[PDB]
Design a binder for this molecule. Structure first.
Ligand SMILES: NC(=O)c1ccc(-c2ncc(-c3ccc(Cl)cc3)o2)cc1
Length: 284
């Protein structure tokens, strides 16, 4: 029932595009009556697209209520004249402290402390576990899709169409080749992506960042599992990276297994890390 969706006129205001265009037509929005912020995903909707759109709303209503997923608020339809085309606004939680990509880029030497990596990675894994239990694959885990609220809460965004995006966080099994002709996403594909995101937090960029995207896409299923460049890291972090980045997804551990891994499981400085992150956020 899309006919019941209200016009957003004096309920939500569009401020500006959020980020720069990583998310596309996603806006910084304001609740008119309170001044509260929201992230507004905007899309042109045709008569045939109506059925596919209904399933998106339902997914957000059921799965976004976990603390490691940005909350869904509601939907609006800005009806255009009979000469088409209507706009659909999906209003979600605004994560003011921005992405994990921004967090590494704003940090001296473009590297995060190991205890920060463990905390963020665990929160990613906790969000993935909620999705996987409900038979949902995120399909796009990367630093830009992991956001921080003003209270250092870690939240996942943009889970699941004519364009292929960035290849750098893609698991080998999602890239079709002669051996793997029918490339398909598995729940374990999100675990590889989590591992690449952990390397991104550690080095400021994913593994084949210096390659043309088409060359990286060719190299991912052919190259051995990527490794951390520095030897400074603990034996537990190298082990976590090794766990995430098992080449063949069939021997790759589950989200439940990775949540029990010593690097994720053993976090005594958890309380201090949350304060440390909150302090970095306070410095706008
Ligand atoms: N200023 C910033 O860097 C910044 C960047 C991003 C955000 C943000 N909050 C929620 C979302 C979101 C993104 C994609 C989707 Cl699909 C849904 C929600 O993005 C806030 C601030």
């Amino acid at each position: 029932d899309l006919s019941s969706l209200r016009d957003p006129a004096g309920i939500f205001e569009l401020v500006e595009v959020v980020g720069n265009g990583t998310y596309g037509q996603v806006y910084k929005g304001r609740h008119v009556k309170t001044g509260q912020l929201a992230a507004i995903k905007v899309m042109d909707v045709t008569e045939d697209e109506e059925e596919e759109i209904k399933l998106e709303i339902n997914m957000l209503k059921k799965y976004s209520h976990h603390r490691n997923i940005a909350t869904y608020y509601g939907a609006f339809i800005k009806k255009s004249p009979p000469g088409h085309d209507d706009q659909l606004w999906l209003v979600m939680e605004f994560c003011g402290a921005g992405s994990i990509t921004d967090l590494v880029k704003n940090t001296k030497g473009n590297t995060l402390k190991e205890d920060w990596i463990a905390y963020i990675s665990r929160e990613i894994l906790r969000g993935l576990a909620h999705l996987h239990i409900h038979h949902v694959i995120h399909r796009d885990i990367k630093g830009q899709n992991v956001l921080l609220t003003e209270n250092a809460e870690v939240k996942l965004v943009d889970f699941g169409n004519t364009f292929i995006g960035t290849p750098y966080w893609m698991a080998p099994e999602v890239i079709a080749c002669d051996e793997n002709p029918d490339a398909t996403y598995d729940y374990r594909s999100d675990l590889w992506s989590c591992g690449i995101t952990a390397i991104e937090m550690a080095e400021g960029a994913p593994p084949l960042c210096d390659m043309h995207p088409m060359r990286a896409l060719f190299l991912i299923p052919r190259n051995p599992p990527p490794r951390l460049k520095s030897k400074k890291w603990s034996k537990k972090f190298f082990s976590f990276i090794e766990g995430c980045l098992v080449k063949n997804y069939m021997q790759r551990p589950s989200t439940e297994q990775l949540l029990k891994h010593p690097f994720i499981r053993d976090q005594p400085n958890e309380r201090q890390v949350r304060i440390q992150l909150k302090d970095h956020i306070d410095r706008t």
